[PDB]
Ligand SMILES: N[C@H](CCC(=O)N[C@@H](CS)C(=O)NCC(=O)O)C(=O)O
């Protein structure tokens with residue numbers, strides 16, 4: 001039977017939406033998790049010297065969004081029509097831009113860089129999310145479904161719900177001014193197979 | 207009949223691989239270009255207040271890679287199999303990461319940022335491309351086709367060839383230590399429909 005392996009750090013980070021695609025699909029996989037200490041010696045194993053990396057029957061696929069889209073297309077979470085799949089991609093790409101914007105914050109919370117999460121949250125994340133959540137609000141207005149694109153859950157939903165809920169665990173004011181984005185996280189995370197995964201996944205700081 | 211519009215600045219930049227997909231496909235489109243000056247009055251029309259943005263029969267799709275993939279799937283430049291398509295995505299996502307890395311350099315040459323382009327080329331671009339072209343070289347070694355993934359052009363190839371060609375016009379030392387990357391740009395840009403587009407496209411600074 002097909003074998004999937006996901007390799008990433010011992011954390012949610014860029015791998016988490018991929019783990020949630022597997023959960024929604026009811027698809028078993030090997031969840032390989034590295035400490036920051038163990039990781040470096042495995043760098044040369046990976047297509048771009050980075051993680052996450054998926055293996056399917058021993059074939060490697062790098063890049064978290066390439067991996068998310070590949071599995072979402074296979075399992076029914078990519079969008080309902082070719083144009084909708086593209087709309088899903090555009091939202092995911094806007095999310096990726098936002099994450100790039102807040103990278104200094106994420107590196108600090110992950111323990112990778114030294115810093116004050118609270119200060120970065122206020123100075124960096126709040127203004128970045130004001131712009132970002134503003135566009136997400138627009139997509140939700142258009143959909144009228146509670147999901148970002150179309151009438152059913154996609155990997156773009158998983159990315160957003162995971163991010164916002166993850167930050168809100170530490171800094172709940174992320175949702176201030178944006179009750180729609182809170183509603184979205186709680187809608188997505190209550191999908192039964194996801195709710196079960198969230199109940200049982202390792203507790204990690206990032 | 208289907209109608210496409212592409213809106214971007216008066217330049218190659220993020221829109222150019224998309225223009226090249228249309229050229230390869232033999233597909234007519236409305237090519238709309240704004241100078242830096244003319245853009246602000248149009249910002250709020252756009253899904254994320256950024257360009258490029260595609261319209262297909264009046265439906266907007268933003269985000270350059272989402273646009274490129276959508277058109278590539280439609281026209282035969284996305285990859286031949288679902289796994290190859292994902293591999294193509296992964297290369298394009300590494301490309302995007304590289305472009306992010308050299309953003310400070312790009313912004314100076316486009317004139318958006320103030321700086322020393324020669325200094326940034328040597329201190330930022332050369333070390334970034336050494337890592338990135340290293341991975342691209344391994345991909346070309348695997349394909350044995352002259353293309354990054356599989357045996358025919360994909361939008362990933364267009365991205366790389368447009369980038370390296372475009373830099374090389376000013377700083378041809380980008381190809382130093384990477385003859386295979388120069389060969390790749392030459393191969394891609396020699397494809398007939400593309401060669402013709404390159405011959406006729408507006409001459410722009412970026
Ligand atoms: N475009 C990114 C690149 C992945 C990335 O920045 N990888 C990090 C994981 S959060 C990593 O490998 N960190 C350790 C290292 O770069 O050596 C993606 O979405 O996968």
Ligand SMILES: N[C@H](CCC(=O)N[C@@H](CS)C(=O)NCC(=O)O)C(=O)O
Pocket residue numbers: 093097219220249255256257258268269270271
């Ligand atoms: N993730 C990018 C973002 C698009 C972007 O940075 N667009 C620039 C043009 S290169 C822009 O609209 N700049 C003008 C502005 O933001 O007002 C993409 O691939 O499309």
